[PDB]
Amino acid sequence: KNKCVNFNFNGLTGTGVLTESNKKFLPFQQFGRDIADTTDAVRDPQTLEILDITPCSFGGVSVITPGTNTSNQVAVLYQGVNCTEVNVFQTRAGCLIGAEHVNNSYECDIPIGAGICASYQTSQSIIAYTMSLGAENSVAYSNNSIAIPTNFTISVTTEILP
Amino acid sequence: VSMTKTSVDCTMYICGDSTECSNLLLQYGSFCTQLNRALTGIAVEQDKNTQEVFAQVKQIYKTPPIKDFGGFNFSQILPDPSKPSKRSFIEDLLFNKVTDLICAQKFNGLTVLPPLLTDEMIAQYTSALLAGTITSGWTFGAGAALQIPFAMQMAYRFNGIGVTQNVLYENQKLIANQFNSAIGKIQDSLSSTASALGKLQDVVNQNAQALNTLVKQLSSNFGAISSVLNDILSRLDPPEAEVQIDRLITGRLQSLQTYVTQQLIRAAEIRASANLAATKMSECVLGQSKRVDFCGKGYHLMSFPQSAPHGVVFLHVTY
Amino acid sequence: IANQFNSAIGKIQDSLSSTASALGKLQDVVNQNAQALNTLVKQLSSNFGAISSVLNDILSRLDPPEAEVQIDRLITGRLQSLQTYVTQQLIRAAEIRASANLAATKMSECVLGQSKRVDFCGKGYHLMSFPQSAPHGVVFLHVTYVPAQEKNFTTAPAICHDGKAHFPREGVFVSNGTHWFVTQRNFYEPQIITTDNTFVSGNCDVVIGIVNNTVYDPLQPELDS
């Protein structure tokens, strides 16, 4: 129990994590099924019990690295799964190994998820930080107050379309 | 605005936990490798729609501690710091009125990627844009923020619609009752009537029917004796199983490509509305447009953006 | 305006010359077609479940009735490959036609005429746009008017002189703390408050925050002279 195994129960072969289930299946009920008609739970022919089948192999593998001319440092990101195999940190996207966590917020460089972005900075290494939404500008407001521009500048914007 | 991000794995989906079955997939070439990039491109486009719409500026504008609106009550659309998650009173009803299901499909090999932009940061976008329009008027997006009295901001907005500003200063007292009462009707209509948000609900249900149906294809035999890979592998010989596996993969490929083809088509329809949402932000919300019935019936004056799950809601003030 | 503008072109030239990624939107078009074509070509090397991917090899080995079985697998698979390519190209055709229509719209509003739309021709108040040819696309140089420096002044909704509230005909009322001036919103150009710069509406008991001052009547000194 509590481990990914290859199990053959009552002739049903499959791989999955075996855990004790709180569901109570009727006596005539052997194996359960979910909405997708995959086995939901199993019952041992010897000692009658209901075991929840949790499939194995969850989460992806992503590489967070700067340009080649920058450095060869890499930060492994496991998306959709916590830290299992294994600078070991966890996020809402999943386990991120190889990147330091900086509380200070900066401008997003390499996007990760859940508002977290990575960059290569200062003895330099990949760091993770919360995406900064920009500097706070508080405009003073009063009934008698107004701001008249005293100067102007001519700007040229470059826009491209295919 | 944004569509639910779903990343499907053609390696696990086509052949579940099967080495021999997966071997036949290599004979098809990039079909699996190609479908992975098609879905990845849709996930990337989902993030670009929120950046080109939600946040039109690089700075954050917050309201001053002492708020004098000249007789108008913005508390409904203003963010409430008392709540754990900062949002406007109107955004609260949108989150509840807009609705495990993913656990079943998540184990089948379909992974839902989280959005790069959280709903919390999205709420702060409408707070900055809505706060800049009140204090900075329409000049916060065209350059340096101009501090202008809100009482004098609507004076010119009437000049653009062909009404002298003299009517605002005199009738501004009666406009407080008509404007405030109009905002209250919106909060009661969304809470009592849940059919106004059906526009966004149809987008979520559109992907739900596509995900559930794609998972139900595994139960179909697709011409094979059985729809289970372990059953055919443990019964028919390797050469005979390949004949049945061919109908399983061929049937699943047609079902997988049909899903990817629909996502690309649905993604195009979402991008069409994304440009409109980005256009209404600058013309309706950010600025003022003389165009008629784009911002809603009547002469347009000001627009207040509001965040909504997998979308955006606009509050337009018309004359 | 000649120094700022001419200096801007120099910045565009340096930016375009130094930064080669500004055109990446166009390079993505070439890359997408290259990947789509390369893929479509490499699918021919796949056997699609057949014994061999070469047709002559199947015909030169299997018997006439047996060769048809293997050739059917190749055709059936190669046909699906075109269905994927054609389908993908039709999708990209909808993406390029959308951008092309947008380019035609900008040329009309931004280039040919002057557009008052917000942030359609680029940030700031749109002056004009000069198109430029680029591979498989077009480049738009948008000249705009962006205010630079700002200063805070005292304002009032109206002026009270004869008992009837006076409103600005154009601009806004501003003061440095001594005298009230009328000026444009885009720039600060002191102008005396006059009957020609304001009009009479309502009274002084309605406008909230109205201030008292003397409205200069050009006709008074003309009658004195």
Residue numbers in the entry:
A (entry chain A): 535 to 620, 641 to 676, 689 to 728
B (entry chain D): 729 to 827, 848 to 1067
C (entry chain A): 923 to 1147
Cite, word for word, the article reporting this structure.
A large number of SARS-CoV-2 neutralizing monoclonal antibodies bind S protein, especially its receptor-binding domain (RBD), providing a basis for vaccine development.
Four cryo-EM maps of the Kappa S trimer engaged with ACE2, including Kappa S-ACE2-C1 (only RBD-1 up), S-ACE2-C2a (RBD-1 and RBD-2 up), S-ACE2-C2b (RBD-1 and RBD-3 up), and S-ACE2-C3 (all three RBDs up), were determined at 4.0-, 3.9-, 3.9-, and 3.9-Å resolution, respectively. In the S-ACE2-C2a, -C2b, and -C3 maps for both the Beta and the Kappa variants, the up RBD-2 or RBD-3 appear also to associate with ACE2 if we lower the map rendering threshold, indicating a dynamic on/off of ACE2 association with these RBDs, in line with our BLI data showing relatively rapid disassociation kinetics between ACE2 and the S trimers (koff = 1.00 × 10−2 s−1/9.34 × 10−3 s−1 for the Beta and Kappa S trimer, respectively). In the meanwhile, RBD-2 swings away from the center and RBD-3 swings in towards RBD-2. This motion presents conformational transitions between Kappa S-ACE2-C2a and -C2b states with RBD-1-ACE2 in the up position, and RBD-2 or -3 tilting up alternatively.
